[PDB]
Ligand SMILES: *[C@@H]1O[C@H](CO)[C@@H](O)[C@H](O)[C@H]1NC(C)=O
Ligand SMILES: *[C@@H]1O[C@H](CO)[C@@H](O)[C@H](O)[C@H]1NC(C)=O
């Protein structure tokens with residue numbers, strides 16, 4: 445859509461958005477990241493070489 | 500050489516040559532390609548899984 | 555140093571240096587490449603599939619008239635380290651290789 | 664005022680005329696001291712038959728670059744940044760054997 449592509453150009457415009465920089469405000473504040481793992485499949489456990497494969 | 504560099508910079512001038520266009524004139528003429536395989540070495544024939552490796 | 559980076563910029567300036575063109579002058583003269591193999595280890599000979607594995611240092615020397623400069627104009631610098639990916643190289647390869655690895659491993663300066 | 668804007672200004676200043684192909688010394692006679700260390704993560708394998716050792720290590724390196732300096736007072740007290748390692752000069756340490 446015209447509006448959607450205008451928005452995507454606006455957001456990622458390298459003139460005003462650098463992906464090498466943390467999104468930190470308030471001086472020395474830290475960025476909170478929430479993590480959650482969802483196990484889709486236990487593919488294999490290779491006991492001989494002690495490796496677990498997961499999807 | 501200066502001459503070879505000039506020739507290369509003249510042939511590939513992106514302003515008048517792009518590689519995304521088939522070199523076809525006269526409407527719907529087709530580009531003829533001549534193919535010839537020359538075998539360097541038969542690396543292996545793996546009978547178990549039915550694969551031939553060649554260079 | 556400022557002079558070293560000025561020299562590096564001047565030598566590799568893509569406007570005046572095309573790394574895909576052979577450094578041959580006078581028209582159709584040839585470029586002489588000196589070659590010398592140095593063996594570091596004979597890693598293995600695998601008799602079953604008939605392959606020898608070696609760790610070698612492949613010395614190559616040639617002349618590039620486009621990478622010249624006058625030392626007095628550059629703080630009396632006599633040599634510089636240029637990345638080998640941004641200069642013209644002779645495509646010297648191990649021609650009788652097995653597994654199809656023609657080229658060198660590292661691409662040092 | 665925001666730290667991200669100051670970091671963007673610092674990045675734009677740092678790499679204005681930076682050349683990553685030049686040894687980072689102010690004077691040609693200066694030597695770049697590289698503090699080198701190893702930190703082993705795990706001993707993956709000792710192949711006695713093929714006489715090879717496989718290891719997982721962290722190759723700790725530390726040196727000084729005279730061009731990548733700034734006054735933190737001019738950039739909202741930004742004291743250190745993280746940048747891609749392929750934008751700067753690095754030593755070419757290789758495993759010989
Ligand atoms: C570099 O060091 C040498 C030896 O100490 C000195 O003679 C020269 O003036 C120095 N150059 C600069 C630009 O500091
Ligand atoms: C600058 O920030 C550091 C934290 O990295 C802090 O220890 C120091 O007191 C700060 N100085 C000023 C002047 O804000």
Ligand SMILES: [Ca+2]
Pocket residue numbers: 708709710711
């Ligand atoms: Ca073993």
